[PDB]
Amino acid sequence: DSEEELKEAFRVFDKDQNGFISAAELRHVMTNLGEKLTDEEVDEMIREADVDGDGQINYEEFVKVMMAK
Numbered sequence: 001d002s003e004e005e006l007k008e009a010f011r012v013f014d015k016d017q018n019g020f021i022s023a024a025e026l027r028h029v030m031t032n033l034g035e036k037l038t039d040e041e042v043d044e045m046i047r048e049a050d051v052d053g054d055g056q057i058n059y060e061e062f063v064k065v066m067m068a069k
């Protein structure tokens with residue numbers, strides 16, 4: 001199930017594992033990834049993906065961002 005795989009990815013991104021992805025958490029995941037992004041790229045991606053501006057991306061939102069852009 002592709003959708004199931006997406007949720008696995010979501011679970012991977014959420015280190016805190018509270019059903020939310022934070023720039024800090026996302027930053028750490030990208031760091032482990034062996035990829036080194038700047039704070040601005042990380043923030044811009046997060047803000048671009050932050051629609052409620054809440055500063056965090058929930059799964060539903062992650063799905064919308066992951067499904068599209």
Ligand SMILES: [Ca+2]
Nearest residue numbers: 016018020021
């Ligand atoms: Ca979180």
Ligand SMILES: [Ca+2]
Nearest residue numbers: 052054056057
């Ligand atoms: Ca949000």
